């Protein structure tokens, strides 16, 4: 009903800062939920696999 | 307590050195200094009050 309309999106993420680069989306259809953030992952820091 | 307000300047108050523009923000006093029309200031020089 008016030119140049708008539409919003509601990316839900987990992390201290929801706008920092690299934040992972919470309810992603392709990406499985990180089922350690609310669990043991809050107690320690698991290193990530890499090369060598 | 929290209070929020806009406190903008009135229209027809384009900022200097900009003149022609149509998104003019009448809130940034740093650019709106003096560039108003609906109000005029005039100071007065008077002898000091002794305290």
């Amino acid at each position: 009903n008016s030119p140049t309309g708008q539409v919003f999106a509601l990316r839900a993420v987990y992390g201290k800062d929801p706008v920092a680069a690299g934040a992972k989306e919470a309810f992603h259809p392709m990406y499985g939920p990180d089922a350690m953030f609310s669990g043991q992952g809050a107690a320690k820091k698991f290193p990530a696999l890499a090369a060598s | 307590l929290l209070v929020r307000y806009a406190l903008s300047a009135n229209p027809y108050t384009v900022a200097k050195d900009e003149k022609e523009a149509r998104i003019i923000d009448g809130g940034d006093m740093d650019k709106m200094a003096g560039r108003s029309d609906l109000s005029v200031l005039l100071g007065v020089k008077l002898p000091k009050i002794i305290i």
Partner: protein, 52 residues
């Protein structure tokens, strides 16, 4: 810590309109009367002494 920088505002509200019109003054400054023909004729009748 979702601040106000996450939510993006939509259409700003239009609070006030501001037209510019002069205090037009001609009804009080002059004397008007509607003329019914493209030529308007006024009568000036003067009272004269025997020296005109």
């Amino acid at each position: 810590s979702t601040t106000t920088n996450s939510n993006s505002i939509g259409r700003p509200n239009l609070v006030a309109l501001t037209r510019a019109t002069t205090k037009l003054i001609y009804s009080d400054i002059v004397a008007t009367q509607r003329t019914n023909q493209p030529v308007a004729a006024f009568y000036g009748i003067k009272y004269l002494n025997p020296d005109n």
